[PDB]
């Protein structure tokens, strides 16, 4: 489903990486649920670099999607794209958000993350807090926790470490730094194996719980390995707007023009794309919302 050949031509590319919470029963739909995380990833084999931009789920945006969807062209939180249109709408909504075509797309459910961490023999994280990082309170199911200090945790713990939010003053932004951390570390671990055999085993270990836009076919490793060095250096960024409360008691995130442009172009420079002087997006800007631009409005 990838009308892109960036990997077959060792050209820099963008992949929308997503963590999906598909729930308890996966009958009707197996890949339907909520965007538990959204990160736009850039990889440039040439400049030998990688960047990760987390996308705030509470960002106010005009959902983009297929006409056959009741929620297309509707103002909601960015979180709602996947929620009411899954992968496709999330992708479309994200492409319109950043004003760019997203080469690939990858989604992994919670088991996948859990398994993935465990597959590389777990990871080591530091709990800067005094209490145990946990979400048993709001999700008694996830009883695992991360005691204060440094520890090598497992998949289950790792999941809890990247979901925690309410005990973190930084809320969803704190929660995201941690989300990026787990991703970056699991890669560092994978790559260290430095074994194509070890890789095959790992991608198959998560195989049943992750769906990609990639071909992953055979003869795909020479091509992909071409970017293994690029993963050696990751610059992480967080896309965020100013907080705001609307007609409904619901709290949102409204991006400013000055910011969203810069971030787009920063990403564009990564994929070797021309940057724009004037901004275009499907998201509600801080200025057009507060009529701060002296327009007819």
CA dihedral 109, 110, 116, 121 (to 10 degrees): 180
CA dihedral 196, 202, 205, 208 (to 10 degrees): -80
- The domains of the chain are located at 1-297
The SS3 of residue 185 is: helix
No. of H helices and E strands in the chain?
9, 14
How would you classify the pairing of strands 34-44 and 49-55? antiparallel
The SS3 of residue 88 is: helix
What are residue 276's phi and psi, to 5 degrees?
A: -100, 145
How would you classify the pairing of strands 133-134 and 123-127? unpaired
- Output the CA–CA distances (angstroms, integers) from residue 90 to 95, 159, 294, in the order listed: 8, 22, 33
User: Which positions ≥6 away from 218 have C-beta within 8 Å?
Assistant: none
Q: Which residue has tokens 């994200």?
A: 94
Q: What is the largest CA-CA distance in the chain?
A: 62
How would you classify the pairing of strands 234-239 and 49-55? parallel
Question: What kind of fold does domain 1-297 have according to CATH?
Answer: Aminopeptidase (3.40.630)
Q: 10 Å Cβ neighbour count for 200?
A: 12
Using CA atoms, how far apart are residues 200 and 17, in angstroms rounded to an integer?
A: 19
Q: 10 Å Cβ neighbour count for 275?
A: 12
Q: 10 Å Cβ neighbour count for 210?
A: 21
User: Which positions ≥6 away from 130 have C-beta within 8 Å?
Assistant: 148
């Amino acid at each position: 489903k990838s009308k892109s050949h960036a990997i077959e031509e060792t050209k820099p590319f963008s992949i929308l990486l997503m963590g999906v919470d598909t729930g308890s029963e996966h009958r009707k739909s197996k890949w339907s649920g909520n965007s538990d995380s959204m990160i736009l990833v850039t990889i440039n084999p040439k400049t030998n670099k990688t960047t990760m931009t987390s996308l705030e789920r509470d960002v106010l945006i005009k959902l983009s999607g297929p006409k056959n969807n009741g929620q297309t062209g509707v103002e909601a939180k960015l979180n709602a794209a996947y929620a009411s249109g899954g992968a496709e709408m999330a992708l479309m909504t994200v492409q319109d958000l950043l004003d760019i075509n997203v080469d690939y797309f990858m989604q992994i459910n919670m088991q996948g993350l859990v398994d993935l961490v465990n597959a590389v023999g777990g990871i080591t994280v530091t709990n800067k807090f005094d209490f145990p990082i946990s979400i048993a309170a709001n999700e008694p199911e996830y009883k695992a926790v991360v005691e204060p200090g440094t520890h090598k945790i497992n998949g289950e713990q790792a999941l809890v470490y990247s979901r925690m939010r309410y005990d973190d003053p930084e809320g969803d932004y704190g929660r995201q730094k941690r989300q990026r951390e787990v991703i970056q570390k699991v890669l560092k671990k994978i790559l260290a194996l430095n074994s194509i055999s070890s890789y095959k085993k790992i991608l198959s270990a998560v195989s049943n719980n992750m769906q990609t836009n990639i071909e992953i076919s055979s003869k795909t490793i020479p091509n992909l390995l071409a970017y293994k060095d690029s993963l050696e250096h990751i610059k992480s960024y967080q896309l965020k707007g100013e907080d705001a409360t609307l007609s409904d008691g619901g709290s949102y995130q409204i991006l400013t023009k000055k910011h969203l442009l810069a971030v787009q172009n920063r990403i564009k420079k990564e994929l070797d794309k021309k940057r724009s002087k004037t901004l275009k997006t499907s998201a509600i800007l801080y200025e057009d919302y507060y009529g701060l631009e002296h327009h007819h409005h």
